[PDB]
């Protein structure tokens, strides 16, 4: 129940993570996570109902979505937890992340096809089934559509924002949630999806296993923000149309509230998380 920085995994941990992901794919379970995510990002809208994205519940929703996926991994191999990718530190394509023993590298320039690693189409083990176009192979263009991943300095500017979220609770909002999501400001989470390219830049972005590692680090930054701002908490706290309030339940599960997900330590801890310090 410890989530570790990907750069620190041992060879056995990398191997067991990859095998568990591939078994979820083989059994059909993986693709349904891809489909759930796509349905929410295509339905979440700034002027109407919004739950998974562009809204305060962006963070607890992805927290619970990753917990569902981690629990499915652990049904295959109980030793496996989600690692996280600190893209502020591991910011080039020669990061161990992108090695053939882990996620494989960038796509070739003719068609963006990933040619190595366990998820390359040529293995026969990673068909892209849930898709928005006919291509059935994993694609990436690392650093193609945007030059740079966020820097640590940029991350620290966002962590410094004290308010969790602010009306109108959407992509136009000031505050921590929307700056971490990326629709305003220096842009953290959205820009990483754009930087990877390929399916990671689309609504069917969980087709790339790096999705989980990116969101695991986004989720760790929420935890880091909480420790920086012990006096700040989720908002809104009641009666807001179209938005998940603190004690309201969230689709698709319907049985869990943002309130049940604010404290990650109920479910996992990190290899390292600095204490509230001054």
């Amino acid at each position: 129940t410890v989530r570790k920085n990907q750069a620190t995994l041992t060879a056995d941990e990398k191997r067991r993570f990859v095998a568990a992901v591939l078994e979820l794919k083989r059994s059909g379970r993986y693709d349904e996570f891809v489909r759930t995510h796509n349905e929410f990002i295509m339905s979440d809208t700034d002027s109407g109902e919004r739950t998974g994205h562009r809204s305060p519940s962006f963070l607890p929703w992805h927290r619970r979505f990753l917990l569902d996926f981690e629990q499915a991994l652990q049904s295959v191999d109980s030793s496996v937890t989600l690692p996280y990718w600190d893209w502020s530190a591991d910011r080039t394509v020669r990061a161990s992340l992108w090695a053939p023993d882990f996620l494989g590298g960038t796509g070739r320039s003719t068609d963006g096809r990933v040619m190595d690693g366990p998820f390359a189409a040529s293995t026969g083990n990673w068909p892209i089934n849930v898709r928005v176009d006919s291509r059935t192979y994993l694609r990436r263009s690392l650093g193609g559509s945007v030059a740079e991943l966020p820097t640590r300095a940029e991350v620290e500017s966002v962590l410094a924002i004290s308010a969790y979220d602010l009306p109108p609770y959407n992509s136009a909002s000031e505050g921590f949630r929307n700056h971490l999501e990326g629709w305003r400001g220096v842009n953290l989470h959205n820009r990483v999806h754009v930087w990877v390219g390929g399916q990671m830049a689309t609504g069917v972005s969980p087709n790339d296993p790096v999705f989980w590692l990116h969101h695991a680090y986004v989720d760790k930054l929420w935890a880091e923000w909480q420790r920086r701002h012990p006096d700040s908490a989720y908002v809104p706290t009641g009666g807001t149309p179209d938005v998940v309030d603190l004690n309201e339940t969230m689709k698709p599960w319907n049985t869990v509230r943002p309130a049940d997900l604010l404290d990650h330590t109920a479910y996992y801890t990190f290899d390292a998380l600095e204490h509230h310090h001054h």
């Binding site: 339905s43 809208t45 992509s171 629709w183 989470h189 830049a201 689309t202």
Partner: protein, 77 residues
Amino acid sequence: AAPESFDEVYKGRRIQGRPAHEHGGGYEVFVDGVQLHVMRNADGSWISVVSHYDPVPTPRAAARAAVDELQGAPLLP
């Protein structure tokens, strides 16, 4: 107040737009006659299902970005 319609051939593909498990609506885009799901953000910018994290100013820009992303591939409905 919706954007104007458009119709052009972009990098060999026909892109069209018109005011109108996915969202509500407002505006429709097509790439070679296949509908491209697009969405408007509060600030007036647009995204699409093939570039869902990268706002562009107009629906034609979103159509063009989809053509660039697809590299000749047909969209699926």
